[PDB]
């Protein structure tokens, strides 16, 4: 028995989310219990809407008025319906059923995008090296990205204005609480390294604008 | 109820991961249903199996088969999964969880508490704790309201680590940021916090660290730095 749900949805603030649960055809989307749960990244799954019709549903704690539930019959899918769509509405959302047993039958969850968040330019802060990890001879540069949308990013490391390849891992980007993104990369090298040029650069890219941050091995 | 969890977070191929869960407020043999779920990195809930309260019966997910047990001590009001012979298919946030037995009102069989989670990387590398660092803030940031400093995690296996600042007193204008993977397999975190520069003549700033796997924790002061 399978639940299929779209990997991804957008949706405008103050209209509504529609997001599908297609149940396999060996059940009946009509007399099924239908489970949604909300998750956001670093909690547990938390339960949003208990579907089975209008007549007896309920939220989930703490979930607001302006969700429901609805159920297609021909398509064989339940829906979770989220109105005066908020940007703290952004997150993960797993259907659920039960079968014959009470064994747990999931989804793979679909991520809700709530359109219109203004964009917002990286806070950018680049870190040298410690004089602790230069005894050790060796030198990491820490490049700290924050608060930006949309969450894509292109990351460059130069040193003395030429291009740094070598030694670079930048993490994918990541959805903070306040819905904005964060990222950071770290240029590793040696000591000897690091102190043979006179400056580097963690150059950010966001949407065409670069913000660019700079450390100088003099100190 | 409270649900709350342990168990190692580094199992070696093939061999057995075991976590347990401990509830308060509910005693675990007089009812519901005690279940455990796992989260592999950037993809959806996967259902593992479940134990009755009161009959002990047990379900599994038909693909964990034999390598699953969930049992129930109440002796101590917990509750267990052990699945052996793991592999990476098994690397996975792993949750216990509970619901309300059939014949209840339907609301109750939704998943109603959760275990924090407990990160489960399938490796045959051995640990290694992080070695900490201090950053300075810039001395023309220091000139200026504000500076950021911070902490640098490096080097560690496997997840998680915990980062505090000031013993946990210090929250407001607190980011710590995902960890990198390293080529090396090796993981790497930062931690930075914003504060009035005023503040940096008057208060410590140190930052704790965190890594249970292996058995590390360190406490950096962040020093202060005019060149």
């Known amino acids: 028995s399978v639940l299929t749900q779209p990997p991804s949805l957008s949706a405008s603030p103050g209209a509504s989310a529609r997001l599908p649960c297609t149940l396999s055809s060996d059940l009946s989307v009509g007399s099924k219990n239908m489970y949604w749960y909300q998750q956001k990244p670093g909690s547990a799954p938390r339960l949003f809407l208990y579907?089975?019709?209008?007549?007896?549903?309920?939220?989930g704690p703490g979930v607001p008025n302006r969700v429901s539930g609805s159920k297609e019959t021909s398509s064989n899918t339940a829906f979770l319906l989220i109105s005066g769509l908020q940007p703290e509405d952004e997150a993960d959302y797993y259907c659920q059923v039960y079968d014959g047993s009470a064994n747990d039958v999931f989804g793979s969850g679909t991520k809700l995008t709530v359109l219109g968040q203004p964009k917002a330019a990286p806070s950018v802060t680049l870190f040298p090296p410690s004089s602790e990890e230069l005894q050790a001879n060796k030198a990491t540069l820490v490049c700290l990205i924050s608060d930006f949308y949309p969450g894509a990013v292109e990351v460059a490391w130069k040193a003395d204005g030429s291009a740094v390849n070598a030694g670079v891992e930048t993490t994918k980007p990541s959805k903070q609480s306040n819905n904005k993104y964060a990222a950071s990369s770290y240029l590793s090298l040696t000591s000897d390294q690091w102190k043979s040029h006179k400056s580097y650069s963690c150059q950010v890219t966001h949407e065409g604008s670069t913000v660019e941050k700079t450390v100088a091995p003099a100190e | 109820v409270q649900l709350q969890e342990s168990g190692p977070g580094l199992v070696k191929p093939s061999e057995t991961l075991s976590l347990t869960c401990a509830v308060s407020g509910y005693s675990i043999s007089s009812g519901y249903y005690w279940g455990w779920i796992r989260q592999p990195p950037g993809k959806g809930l996967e259902y593992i199996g479940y134990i009755s309260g009161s009959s002990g019966s047990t379900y599994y997910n038909p693909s964990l088969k034999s390598r699953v047990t969930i049992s129930k001590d109440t002796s101590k009001n917990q509750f267990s999964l052990k699945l052996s012979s793991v592999t990476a298919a098994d690397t996975a946030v792993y949750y216990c969880a509970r619901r309300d037995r059939v014949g209840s009102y339907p609301y109750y069989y939704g998943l109603d508490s959760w275990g924090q989670g407990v990160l489960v990387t399938v490796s045959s590398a051995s640990t290694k704790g992080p070695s900490v660092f201090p950053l300075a803030p810039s001395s023309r940031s220091t000139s200026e309201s504000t500076a950021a400093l911070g902490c640098l995690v490096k080097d560690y296996f496997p997840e998680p680590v915990t980062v505090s600042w000031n013993s946990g007193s210090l929250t407001s204008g607190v980011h710590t940021f995902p960890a990198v993977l390293q080529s090396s397999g090796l993981y790497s975190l930062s931690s930075v916090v914003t504060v009035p520069s005023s503040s940096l003549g008057t208060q410590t700033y140190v930052c704790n660290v965190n890594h249970k796997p292996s058995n590390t924790k360190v406490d950096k002061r962040v020093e202060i730095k005019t060149c």
């Open positions: 579907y089975y019709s209008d007549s007896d549903k309920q939220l």
